[PDB]
Amino acid sequence: ATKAVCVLKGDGPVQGTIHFEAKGDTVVVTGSITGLTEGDHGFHVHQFGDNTQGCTSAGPHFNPLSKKHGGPKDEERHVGDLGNVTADKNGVAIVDIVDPLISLSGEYSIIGRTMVVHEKPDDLGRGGNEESTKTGNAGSRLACGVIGIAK
Amino acid sequence: ATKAVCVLKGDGPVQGTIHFEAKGDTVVVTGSITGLTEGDHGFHVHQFGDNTQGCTSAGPHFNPLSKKHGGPKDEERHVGDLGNVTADKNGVAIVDIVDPLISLSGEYSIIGRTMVVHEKPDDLGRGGNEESTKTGNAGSRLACGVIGIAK
Amino acid sequence: ATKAVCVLKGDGPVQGTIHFEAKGDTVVVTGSITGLTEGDHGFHVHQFGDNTQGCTSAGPHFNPLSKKHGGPKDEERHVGDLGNVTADKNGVAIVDIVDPLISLSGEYSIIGRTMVVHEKPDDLGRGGNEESTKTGNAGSRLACGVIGIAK
Amino acid sequence: ATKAVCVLKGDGPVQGTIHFEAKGDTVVVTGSITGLTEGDHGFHVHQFGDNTQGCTSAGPHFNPLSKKHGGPKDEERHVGDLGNVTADKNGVAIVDIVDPLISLSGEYSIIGRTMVVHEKPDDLGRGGNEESTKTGNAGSRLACGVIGIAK
Ligand SMILES: [Cu+2]
Ligand SMILES: [Cu+2]
Ligand SMILES: [Cu+2]
Ligand SMILES: [Cu+2]
Ligand SMILES: [Zn+2]
Ligand SMILES: [Zn+2]
Ligand SMILES: [Zn+2]
Ligand SMILES: [Zn+2]
Numbered sequence A, B, C, D: 001a002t003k004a005v006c007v008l009k010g011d012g013p014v015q016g017t018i019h020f021e022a023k024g025d026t027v028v029v030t031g032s033i034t035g036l037t038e039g040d041h042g043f044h045v046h047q048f049g050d051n052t053q054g055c056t057s058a059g060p061h062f063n064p065l066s067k068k069h070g071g072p073k074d075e076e077r078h079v080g081d082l083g084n085v086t087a088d089k090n091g092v093a094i095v096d097i098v099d100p101l102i103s104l105s106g107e108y109s110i111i112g113r114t115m116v117v118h119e120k121p122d123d124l125g126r127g128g129n130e131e132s133t134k135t136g137n138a139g140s141r142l143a144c145g146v147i148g149i150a151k
Helices: none
Strands: A003-009 A015-023 A026-034 A039-046 A052-055 A081-087 A093-099 A114-118 A141-146 B003-008 B015-023 B026-034 B039-046 B052-055 B081-087 B093-099 B114-118 B141-146 C003-008 C015-023 C026-034 C039-046 C052-055 C081-087 C093-099 C114-118 C141-146 D003-009 D015-023 D026-034 D039-046 D052-055 D081-087 D093-099 D114-118 D141-146
Touching (some): A015 A093, A039 A093, A081 A093, B081 B093, C015 C141, C039 C093, D015 D141, D039 D093
Antiparallel strands (some): B003 B015, B015 B026, B026 B093, C114 C141, D039 D114
């Protein structure tokens, strides 16, 4: 697959759609998310496309290299670490990410996994506590969806 | 990926969880669907893991061998042709399928695609109209979900 | 039966010949209707090949899947829902339909049933009254005939 | 179908309605025909439900076993060979035939074919000439109709 899609849904008003496209050795991640409080929100690929108990059953960050949490620009990061998306005053975030580590095929493929938008900003591993090194202190899972093959 | 899961949701009361497991050289499909009308309902892997327009955006049946619609025992069938699930009088269908065409990795992978439960029985491609050769006259898509990697 | 024919007759000037042919996996509908008013007229397979009370005794639309009335492109439609034919200013309609639900043998066969051309356009089940969900508000039956096996 | 109907019409005053009902391995043929000259009239299922050029376009006797013409009681007969109906002095014939060879379903089905009442008596193949072995010398087609599925 060179194209993928994710519909983000949660138990509150947060929703959106994310598009994924293979370009060179990168994945180009675009889309939009509504209903968010203004400011940054952690945005991560979680390990499992399991929504049986909601976003919680997606498990931790997709992490096949067994590293600690960081920002997308960091060497020490989880594959699923895409940093922050930014909502404006209207609650809307436009997603425009280009990432070399995630993939839509092969070993680091995110097809069949879960995209999650978080309650709080991702501190990118620089928070000075244990949690920062795990989730970036991004807190609760506002909305999520399984990543699917798109036409 | 040796285990997958799917959570089925639609516009109506129909819901359920489908489990997939790679066992030996085959794929075992289990789970249950509730809120169905008594009797048979088409049960198919649709091509796209795309829920942007609910179940409609899943596209046609997964069909990488470019065949006509059939039953799961037929040579001429789509890879996604898993026949019928059967609901009892309480609207409950127990899912128990072993299938030789689907997989959980490589060309035949259904990870990132869509499981659909239909309004009507699948006629296994033997209805005698053109629709039968496409969908088995299974009709509308009551509920669907993207197939995700499971723990 | 791979070819069928229908001769349309009514109480007024409306007449025509409709040809049906099983081609590939589908049914191609051709022919022409004359004596019509300019514009659209509902064109439907009615259930009974019964002309004992003219076109009235043909009964409702052929509907073996127990659905509501729609257009021929719709999922929710009767098997007999072939939409509209269009008459030009001289009252002539050229019939050119390919249809996935009708057949010329087996469950979906329209052989021995009735082709009806209606007074008014078919609203494709979107008119918003109850009648729309039955007949598309197509109104009276200008002309009809029993579908017969052709050489 | 277990029930069928035919409205007989022609270019003259002969008309009637014929009813067909599946009973055991027979079809029970009933109805009435008016406007006839007193005496016997050949009564046959013709091959095609094609009325585009009137009764003539119905073609020959329905004959899927490729036999010669006889009476309904004869081994050598066409499937469409139902013998004679008898008009009284008032021009009225009451039809009451029970036949094992015609069918309303499967290979010998007469649904979509044509019922014809003839000018002259059917000589039942015993006329001593070539025509007798083809049509029973029943002569012209007074009235006919396509056989349709009835409620
Ligand atoms: Cu996260
Ligand atoms: Cu399907
Ligand atoms: Cu109609
Ligand atoms: Cu004859
Ligand atoms: Zn992380
Ligand atoms: Zn199929
Ligand atoms: Zn209709
Ligand atoms: Zn004969």
